[PDB]
Scaffold this motif. Structure first.
Motif, PDB file in Angstrom:
ATOM      1  N   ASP A  78      -0.089  14.996 -34.769  1.00 22.65           N
ATOM      2  CA  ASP A  78      -0.222  13.815 -35.612  1.00 22.65           C
ATOM      3  C   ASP A  78      -1.488  13.135 -35.094  1.00 22.65           C
ATOM      4  O   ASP A  78      -1.511  12.631 -33.973  1.00 22.65           O
ATOM      5  CB  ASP A  78       0.994  12.906 -35.413  1.00 22.65           C
ATOM      6  N   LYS A 107       0.002  10.912 -42.444  1.00 19.75           N
ATOM      7  CA  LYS A 107      -0.081  11.869 -41.345  1.00 19.75           C
ATOM      8  C   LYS A 107       1.196  11.974 -40.515  1.00 19.75           C
ATOM      9  O   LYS A 107       1.696  13.073 -40.264  1.00 19.75           O
ATOM     10  CB  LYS A 107      -1.272  11.525 -40.440  1.00 19.75           C
ATOM     11  N   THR A 108       1.729  10.841 -40.077  1.00 19.89           N
ATOM     12  CA  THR A 108       2.948  10.881 -39.281  1.00 19.89           C
ATOM     13  C   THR A 108       4.116  11.398 -40.108  1.00 19.89           C
ATOM     14  O   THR A 108       4.930  12.188 -39.621  1.00 19.89           O
ATOM     15  CB  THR A 108       3.271   9.493 -38.706  1.00 19.89           C
ATOM     16  N   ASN A 152       3.726   6.427 -33.278  1.00 22.91           N
ATOM     17  CA  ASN A 152       4.869   6.217 -34.170  1.00 22.91           C
ATOM     18  C   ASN A 152       5.734   7.472 -34.316  1.00 22.91           C
ATOM     19  O   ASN A 152       6.911   7.380 -34.645  1.00 22.91           O
ATOM     20  CB  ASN A 152       4.398   5.826 -35.580  1.00 22.91           C
ATOM     21  N   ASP A 203      -1.802  10.136 -31.904  1.00 23.03           N
ATOM     22  CA  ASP A 203      -2.312   8.846 -32.361  1.00 23.03           C
ATOM     23  C   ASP A 203      -2.102   7.874 -31.206  1.00 23.03           C
ATOM     24  O   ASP A 203      -1.181   7.053 -31.209  1.00 23.03           O
ATOM     25  CB  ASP A 203      -1.553   8.365 -33.600  1.00 23.03           C
TER      26      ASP A 203
HETATM   27 MG   LIG Z   1       0.669   7.685 -38.186  1.00 27.43          MG
END
Ligand SMILES: [Mg+2]
Ligand SMILES: Nc1ncnc2c1ncn2[C@@H]1O[C@H](COP(=O)(O)OP(=O)(O)O)[C@@H](O)[C@H]1O
Length: 237
Positions: free
Chosen positions: A118, A16-17, A45, A40
């Motif tokens: 994200d 995802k990131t 991140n 998140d």
């Molecule tokens: Mg992530």
């Protein structure tokens, strides 16, 4: 454009990131104004992956009602790419009301062509609050049946919640001889396969470098796949 897209998954560690960061840079490179949002809350991140390591004001501050979202918007070293970073410290995690994510994010709709969120994986509070902040959803999954079925479930939930499901990305393909091939993965997902991102050390290198592979190593298979994904995302407008 003001397209708010939630980058989601049934499991964590699926990419995802990585997809959020690379897609942001790819779209920004095509001339689109992008806002990469780190939704998140417990595992911020995104900002780090985009090379913005020192933000004093984050989405967490905004969600705690201690700052205006305008003051949590930062530039990145990438053309047309901005970031709404998340704090990493636990105190910030605690005070951030996730229920305010939808109102906060949507209030920025008129200032960007794309707002990529994200999201943490799953269906718990933080995950739902982030995913439901978007209007569209890009499913991210790995070639594992369990990951596919789990992500599928998330898509169904978001679909019922009113979000337009753009399709899915089959990430980390080629990591194992047991990976479900794309044609079969699409047959399982029940949604359009928008892109196959191969398992590529270049992507991991970009992650650690703080510069998404799409730009850091432009000739890598991973970089090229993300450029194509960006093209597809624009077409689905
Ligand atoms: Mg992530
Ligand atoms: N296609 C890929 N090839 C190689 N490494 C990848 C790929 N996609 C993701 N990764 C690496 O896997 C890790 C997990 O990705 P990440 O995007 O952080 O997952 P998530 O946001 O879903 O938890 C990262 O260290 C990242 O560099």
């Amino acid at each position: 454009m003001g397209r708010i897209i939630s980058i989601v998954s049934g499991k964590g560690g699926t990419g995802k990131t990585t997809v959020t960061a690379n897609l942001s840079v790819a779209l920004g490179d095509r001339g689109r104004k992008v806002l990469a949002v780190d939704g998140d809350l417990t595992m911020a991140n995104l900002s780090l992956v985009l090379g913005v390591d020192d933000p004093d004001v984050t989405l967490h501050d905004v969600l705690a009602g201690e700052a205006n979202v305008e003051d949590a918007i930062y530039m990145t070293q990438f053309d047309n790419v901005y970031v709404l970073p998340g704090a990493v410290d636990w105190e910030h995690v605690l005070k951030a009301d996730p229920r305010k994510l939808p109102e906060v994010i949507k209030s920025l709709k008129d200032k960007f062509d794309f707002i990529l969120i994200d999201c943490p994986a799953g269906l718990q509070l933080d995950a739902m609050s982030a995913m439901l902040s978007g209007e569209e959803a890009l499913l991210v999954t790995n070639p594992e049946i369990s990951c596919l079925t789990d992500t599928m479930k998330v898509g169904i939930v978001l679909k019922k919640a009113g979000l337009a499901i753009l399709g899915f990305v089959l990430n980390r393909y080629g990591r194992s001889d047991r990976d479900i091939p794309p044609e079969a993965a699409e047959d399982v997902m029940e949604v359009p396969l928008l892109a196959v991102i191969p398992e590529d050390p270049a992507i991991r290198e970009g992650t650690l470098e703080g510069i998404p592979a799409v730009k850091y190593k432009p000739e890598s298979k991973g970089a090229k796949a993300f450029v194509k994904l960006a093209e597809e995302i624009e077409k689905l407008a």
